[PDB]
Design a protein around this nucleic acid. Structure first.
Length: 92
DNA sequence: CGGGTTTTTGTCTGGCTTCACACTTGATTTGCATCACTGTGTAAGACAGGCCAGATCCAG
């Protein structure tokens, strides 16, 4: 079952398709394999109605800091009736 | 009871990455320990004793 083996074998299996994608990228974008594969996988996720994972992927492709400032954490801790102990529990 | 037919993979091989890898040291940020209290335990039932009430016996 593919997507479960290790490397150097799944390659040997998908070598034909990989060289075809390489030819297509060379013909279209001259070798921009990374971007075209990213777009193909994003649309493949969107086809199966998996917007959450696709959004997470397109957000991490930037690699960004999704950290909340302490004001927002304080607002959440106050306006939701949370004791400091339970908030610390959730935090850890 | 073991001859063929496909996966499943470290390998050779040297030349290239993005990553990895040694003292400071003063603040700076986490992470953990410490201390005085806490809330849930939350209505009835069995029994002895005193008390009159009306019944229990006694008298000429």
């Amino acid at each position: 079952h593919l997507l479960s083996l290790t490397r150097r074998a799944q390659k040997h299996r998908l070598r034909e398709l990989k060289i075809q994608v390489k030819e297509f990228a060379d013909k279209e974008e001259g070798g921009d394999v990374k971007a075209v594969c990213l777009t193909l996988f994003l649309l493949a996720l969107r086809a199966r109605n998996e917007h959450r994972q696709a959004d997470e992927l397109e957000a991490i492709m930037q690699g960004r800091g999704s950290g909340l400032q302490p004001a927002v954490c304080l607002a959440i801790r106050v306006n939701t009736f949370l004791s400091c102990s339970q908030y610390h529990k959730m935090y850890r």
